Amino acid sequence: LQDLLFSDGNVKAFLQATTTDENKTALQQLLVSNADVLGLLSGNPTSDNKINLRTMIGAGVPYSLPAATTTTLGGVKKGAAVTASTATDVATAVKDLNSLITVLKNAGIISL
């Protein structure tokens, strides 16, 4: 009787409660007009769909913290411990300054 009453085969499969993946694609298209949402409903959105779906919900991509560069904000590693200076001569004061410089160089806080 459903064959006598309905022409569309995708509708008929829905009414029989047995749909193929192709029937489901067509039925999705009857229910939703946004192309990126149709991409989501397929379970296999294209690259363009993915970008647009994130825009649609205001989502970001997985963020990876980059190392600091001389031009670009980034993360650093924390420098090793450095002892306060008790230097009473120039040689030792210079030794202590250099220890700080190396620590900051080791942590990528300043350039080599």
Added chain:
Amino acid sequence: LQDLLFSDGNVKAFLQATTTDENKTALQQLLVSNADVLGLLSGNPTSDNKINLRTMIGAGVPYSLPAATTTTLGGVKKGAAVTASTATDVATAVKDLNSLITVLKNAGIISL
């Protein structure tokens, strides 16, 4: 015959395999109860839907690495190169310490 058999107009459009965007909104509502998922299926989720959709899948927003501050963890730029010290007097040792300080200041590793 479909007009004689079914009262709901959105169902009837589905059975004819021709749905408007309004029909699709109504059919989505027959198929899915979660309001944030319905927002996604529209292709135009509200701000609230977007937040809830990310929560739903455990997704984060696009991460931007902030510069380090005195209160908040952040990225740094790597400091310029600094030569090891071969100072034999106080004046030179102080010159070398100051070179390290400026490098760390230039890279925003320490405050001005």
